[PDB]
RNA sequence: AAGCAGCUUUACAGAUCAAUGGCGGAGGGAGGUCAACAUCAAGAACUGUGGGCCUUUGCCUAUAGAACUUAUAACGAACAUGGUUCUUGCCUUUUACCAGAAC
């Protein structure tokens, strides 16, 4: 097994460097989701109970999405829908109409966060 | 529109009393605080049918039919409630509330 690893060379990849630091939250950034279609913005749920939407190219802040009362743990953006799904430690799963930026279609049943 | 002729029918006397041609006829009418199924808010908006293009979709062209609803816009010349979210009001907590919005 060990002579077959030395027989093989890994693919070269280009290294990574920091290009932009964005300071906008009041707590920890706990989750990041990208726009799956057309790639203009990303959204960061956080520890200050609010999700912010950041433009990918310029780095400016587009909007803030409040509506959770505890820390937003994960954020998922849909490719087939204009829907944003967001869970938190406050036992809530929420949907968001991105054509309206309002909470629709709330989900219920998790015993904990 | 009286009257005459032409036309369409009509009670019919017919010609034919055949092959015909026209209209009607080859399982009703009125209803029911009966039922089922469709359908009832959108480029001012529908569908069937023929033709051509591309390769079925879509477009263009020709044609037929469009009930109900709608312009001081809506089936209802009528008018309640609930959910979420935002902003207020009441001010021990909650429910029940206050009264505007958006969905
Ligand atoms: Mg108590």
Swiss-Prot record:
Record-given protein name: Pre-mRNA-splicing factor PRP46
Subunit structure: Belongs to the CWC complex (or CEF1-associated complex), a spliceosome subcomplex composed of the U2, U5 and U6 snRNAs and at least BUD13, BUD31, BRR2, CDC40, CEF1, CLF1, CUS1, CWC2, CWC15, CWC21, CWC22, CWC23, CWC24, CWC25, CWC27, ECM2, HSH155, IST3, ISY1, LEA1, MSL1, NTC20, PRP8, PRP9, PRP11, PRP19, PRP21, PRP22, PRP45, PRP46, SLU7, SMB1, SMD1, SMD2, SMD3, SMX2, SMX3, SNT309, SNU114, SPP2, SYF1, SYF2, RSE1 and YJU2. Interacts with CEF1, CLF1, NTC20, PRP45 and SYF1.
Protein function: Involved in pre-mRNA splicing. May also be required for cell cycle progression at G2/M.
Record localization: Cytoplasm; Nucleus
WD repeats: 24-55, 67-97
Recorded family membership: Belongs to the WD repeat PRL1/PRL2 family.
Additional remark text: Present with 1770 molecules/cell in log phase SD medium.
Organism: Saccharomyces cerevisiae (strain ATCC 204508 / S288c) (Baker's yeast)
């Amino acid at each position: 097994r060990y002579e077959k690893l030395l027989s093989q060379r890994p693919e070269w990849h280009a290294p990574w460097k920091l290009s932009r630091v964005i300071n906008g939250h009041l707590g920890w950034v706990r989750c990041v989701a990208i726009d799956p279609v057309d790639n203009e913005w990303f959204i960061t749920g956080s520890n200050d109970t609010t999700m912010k939407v950041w433009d990918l190219a310029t780095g400016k802040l587009k909007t803030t999405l409040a509506g959770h009362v505890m820390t937003v743990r994960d954020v998922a953006v849909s490719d087939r829908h204009p829907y944003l799904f967001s869970v938190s430690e406050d036992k809530t799963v929420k949907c968001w109409d991105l054509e309206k930026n309002q909470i629709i279609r709330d989900y219920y049943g998790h015993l904990s966060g």
